[PDB]
Paper text:
The structures are labeled according to the number of RBD bound with nAb as mono (1 RBD), double (2 RBDs) or triple (3 RBDs) binding, respectively. The results showed that after 120 min incubation, some nAbs such as P2B-1A10, P5A-1B8, P5A-2G9 and P5A-1B6, induced about 80% shedding of S1 subunit of the S protein. The first group, including P2B-1A10, P5A-3A1, P5A-1B8, P5A-2G9, P5A-1B6, P2B-1A1 and P5A-2G7, has the largest overlap between the epitope and the ACE2-binding site on the RBD. Their epitope residues are distributed across the receptor binding motif (RBM), mainly in the cradle region. Among the 17 RBD residues involved in ACE2 binding, more than half (8 to 15) were recognized by the antibodies in group 1.
RBD, which directly binds to ACE2 receptor, is a major target for development of the therapeutic nAbs against COVID-19. The prefusion structure of S protein exhibits more dynamic conformational changes in S1 region, especially in RBD, which has two distinctive conformations, “up” and “down”.10,11 Only the “up” conformation of RBD can bind to the ACE2 receptor. To further explore the interactions between nAbs and S proteins, we solved cryo-electron microscopy (cryo-EM) structures of the S protein in complex with ten nAbs, in full-length IgG-form or in both IgG-form and Fab-form. Bivalent binding was revealed for the full-length form nAbs, which showed that the full-length form exhibits different binding mode and induces more RBDs to the “up” conformation than the Fab-form that is monovalent.
Numbering used by the authors:
A (entry chain J): 1 to 229
B (entry chain N): 1 to 214
C (entry chain C): 347 to 593
D (entry chain B): 451 to 475, 487 to 494
Amino acid sequence: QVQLVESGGGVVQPGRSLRLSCAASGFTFSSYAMHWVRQAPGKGLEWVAVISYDGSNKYYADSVKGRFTISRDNSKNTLYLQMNSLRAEDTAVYYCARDGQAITMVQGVIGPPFDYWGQGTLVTVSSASTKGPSVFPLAPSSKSTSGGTAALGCLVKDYFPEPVTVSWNSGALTSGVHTFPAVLQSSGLYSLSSVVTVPSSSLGTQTYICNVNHKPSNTKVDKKVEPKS
Amino acid sequence: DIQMTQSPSSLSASVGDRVTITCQASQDISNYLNWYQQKPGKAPKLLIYDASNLETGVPSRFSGSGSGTDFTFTISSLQPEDIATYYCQQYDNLPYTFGQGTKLEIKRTVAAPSVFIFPPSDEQLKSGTASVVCLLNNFYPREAKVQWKVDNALQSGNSQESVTEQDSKDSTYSLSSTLTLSKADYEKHKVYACEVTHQGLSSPVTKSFNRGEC
Amino acid sequence: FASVYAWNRKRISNCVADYSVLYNSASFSTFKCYGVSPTKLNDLCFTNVYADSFVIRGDEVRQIAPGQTGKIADYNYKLPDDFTGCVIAWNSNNLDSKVGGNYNYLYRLFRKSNLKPFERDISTEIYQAGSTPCNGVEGFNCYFPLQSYGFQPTNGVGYQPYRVVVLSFELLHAPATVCGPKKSTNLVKNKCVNFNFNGLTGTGVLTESNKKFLPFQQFGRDIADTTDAVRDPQTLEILDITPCSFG
Amino acid sequence: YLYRLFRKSNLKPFERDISTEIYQANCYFPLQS
Ligand SMILES: *[C@@H]1O[C@H](CO)[C@@H](O[C@@H]2O[C@H](CO)[C@@H](O)[C@H](O)[C@H]2NC(C)=O)[C@H](O)[C@H]1NC(C)=O
C-alpha cells in the first residue's frame, strides 16, 4: 500500500556533494507531486523543494537555489535530491511527502497534501572518523546524597558517531536510570552523562557497572562507580 | 512573495481540557492551510486539511476555523496520549512557509529537585581536562536555573545543560549541567559550587565540594 | 453540466412547478431551503425562479450558502446574504469522473476582489500577484487564473464530483407568475357540500341545469347578485346551485 | 441552553411539548444549540 522508504544520508565534510533516495510504493507515482521538507534538530519544519509529475517545475526556496537539484524516477517510483556546495549548516533530518493540490504543478487537484511517510538524516561535521568515547565514573557523594537515596553515574564524552549507549549493570537497573541528551561541544564532538539514584544505605554495597557500547565503532567498556575515596 | 505564520507556542494543560492554538497568517490573504502533529522520535502526521474537515483514523477531538488571515486549531477533551508538537503549514504560493511549533506539557504538583555535584574523576585530570557535573533529579517546573560558581565567581560560558523528556511515570524532569575546564585552570581554584534555583525551593540550594579533599 | 466558474443560468418562467417531486425524491444528498421551508413551496407563487447549475468537489458544498468564504464562494459563485431559494446537491461520481482524470472541470482560484452576489466572471487574464507587471506571460507572481479538478473514480468521498442546482425565487413587482399545482378531487351532486370552482367558494347542493352560458362565461348570478349557477372547468357543463335547506 | 425546537404541534397556547423523534429523512433534529 501507500508507504515510502528513504536512504542515502550519513556523515560527510562540508563542501562535498551527496544525492538522496526517496522511493514510493502502492499508489501510482507518476501522477502525484513530491515535496522535500527538513528540520534542523531542535527547530521547526522547513519546506525545501518540490517538483511536478516530472514536468520540470522546481520553484526553489531562498539560498537553496544553485545548491540543490531534484530528480525523480517515474519508471522506478524513486526520487533523488542531490545537493552540492554544502555549508556545514544544512545538517538535519529530511522528509519527502506527496502532494496533489498545487497550481502550476500536477494536473487536477486530488486528495490531501503532505501524507508524510518518510525519514532519514544527514550529518555534516568534521569528525569524519568515529572518535572513540572517553568514560569516567561520577561517584556517589554526600553532596549528591540526601536522606534515603544517593545518585551515581557515568560520564561518556568526546565522540563523533552520534548513536552511543550506556546501560547500567548489563541492563539490570531500570529504576532511577536516566541518560541525558548528548551535548554537542564547540570541538565538534558529542558528550553525555547517565545517572541513577540508589538508596544511600547501598552506596558501595551492590554492583553498579555502566556498560558503554559504541555501535559505529566497536567500543565496549564496563566501568564501576564507587563512593569517593 | 514572502509570508509567515505565528503561534502561541509552548503551552501546557491537564487531562480532559480544551486548548487553542492561533496561527495568524501574513499579508496577502490565503485560503485554508493544515494542522500537523509530531510525536518526537518519529515522523509528522496530517490531522486537518485546509480550514477544517479532518481525515480518517483521527479520534475526532479536533477542529479548525479558517476565515481569511487568522486560523484557530481547537482541541476539546484532552487525552493522556496526545502530547506532541503541532506545526501548521500554509500554502498558495512559491515558498510554503510553516509555523513555529507548540510544545505540550501536562500538569504535576510542584516537586523540588534532588541536587548533586560530581567532581572530575582522577582519570580525566591525567588527560588534561576537568568536567564538573551537577545533577538535578526529578522536578516538575523545568524552568530551573543552574548557576556555577568557582571560588564564589559566577561562571559564564563554559557550561552545557540537557534535560530529559517528561517522565511517563511521575511526570518530572531531570537536568544535567556540565562545567568544562582545563586541568591547569581547574588546579587554580578551590571551591566548586552549583547553585540551583527552582519554584519548589524557598531559597536556592548549593551543592559544593573542595578540590582535593577526600 | 456546467463548470463552476461559468455556471449556467436558466430562467424558469410561467409554469406549474411541483417542488414535491423534488423534495421527496430521496436521491438528493443535500436539500436546504433558506427563505422558505421546503414543504410550503407547493403553496406559494412568485414572479421568477432562476436555476443555476454547476459541478464542484464533494466538500465544497458547504460554501454554497448565504454568508460563507472560500475559493468557491469568494470568486466563483456568491449567494446574497438574504437568499430566498433552495440549494440542492447530489453525488455524481459515475458520470463526471473518468479513469486517468477528467480535466475538463475547472475553477477560478485567483481574483482581484470577491464577487458581488450572483456576479459572473469568465475572463482569462493572467493574474498578477506581485507588484511586477505581467505583460501577458507567465512566471513568478504571474499566474494563469484557472485550475482543473482532476477527477478520478478512485477518489475518497469529498473529492468526488457533486452536481449542484441553486433555485432562487425572486419577486420583482409584476402581476403574478409561476405557482404550485392547486389540488382537486372528484365531484358529487344532490347533496349539501362545500364546493370550490376555481376560487368560487360556497356551500350548497349542486344539480344539473337547463341554462346555456356563452362560451366565455364561467358562472351565473341572479338579481341581488347571488351565485346561482356555475361551470365546472373540466366537463364544460353548467350546474345549478341551491342553498342547503334551513328553517 | 439547548432551546429552539421544531415540530408538528404548532402549540395551542400555554402547552409545552417535550420529546425527541427525529425530522431526519440529510438529517434534522428538533433542537439547536
Ligand atoms: C380534461 O382531461 C380529461 C382527461 O384527463 C378529459 O376527459 C375526457 O373527456 C372526453 C370528453 O370530451 C371523454 O370522451 C373522455 O373519455 C375523457 N377521458 C378521460 C380520461 O377522462 C377532459 O375532456 C379534459 N377537459 C378539458 C377541458 O381539458
